[PDB]
């Protein structure tokens, strides 16, 4: 619940060629579908959050992508070790 923490400055895509691969980061700010400087314009849309403004209220979500790849461990939990 980021309602108290976190205003029209958040964008989301509406038109695109296809879905992006997992964890893809694409950035483009033009070339709408039909209707460069013509009626076809910026493709993302600003969210309707405002300091003066339940489901229409601003939240925030974060993801902790945990990679279980076989590699030298770097980030470990708070487990106390013992003698072997």
């Amino acid at each position, epitope marked *: 619940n980021s309602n108290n*923490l*976190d*205003n*029209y*400055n958040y*964008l989301y895509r509406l038109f695109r060629k296809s879905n992006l691969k997992p964890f893809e980061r694409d950035i483009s*700010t033009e070339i709408y579908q039909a209707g460069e400087g013509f009626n076809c314009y*910026f493709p*993302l*849309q*600003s969210y309707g959050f*405002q*300091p*003066t403004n339940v489901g229409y209220q601003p939240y925030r979500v974060v993801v902790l992508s945990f990679e279980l790849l076989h590699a030298p461990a770097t980030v470990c939990g708070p487990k106390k070790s013992t003698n072997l």
Partner: antibody
Amino acid sequence: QVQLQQSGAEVKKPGESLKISCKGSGYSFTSYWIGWVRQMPGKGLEWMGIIYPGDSDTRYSPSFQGQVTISADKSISTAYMQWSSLKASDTAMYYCARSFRDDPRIAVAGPADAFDIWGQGTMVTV
Amino acid sequence: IQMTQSPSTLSASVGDRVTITCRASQSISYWLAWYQQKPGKAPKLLIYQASSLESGVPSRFSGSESGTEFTLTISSLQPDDFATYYCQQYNSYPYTFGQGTKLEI
């Protein structure tokens, strides 16, 4: 050249009707937010009242209900502030403001900030 | 909401690292603005959202934030830095400004 042409200085008596000028030129007026802050001369500042010139949506502070009525005709693209009864408490140096955009200025440019560029300033002695 | 600025007069010499305190009352964490004004000129933006530098001002100026407390800190003073600065919060309406400080010799 993003510019906001403010009108000049004036000296009037209370009770008259008034219309001032804030002409925006050199940018997209319908895409920018319009913030409002008034500056009393030589002292602090107080929000006099804000309007959304996109559709004339009036939203004034509770302490400023009906005292100032802002307008903006998109034909000449200049923002007017109306008075129905001039008051001595509002003699000051007024500053009408556009919105500043720093993150994807061309995305929406609306509801971004309240200080982009000002003209010579209309010191409105009400 | 009352905004306090200290000190009213800040006597500093060329190169003096001086700081002014701009303390708030409640949570305005995200959106907070700073402005600089010259005698007879319009206030120009210095720092918006309390963490981003505005274009047009030399990078020597910097603003700091700490919870409800905020401090404008000039690390390397310039001979032209003797001026007046103000505050502005824009996290929650209405927006209020600071008091200001005059710099004398």
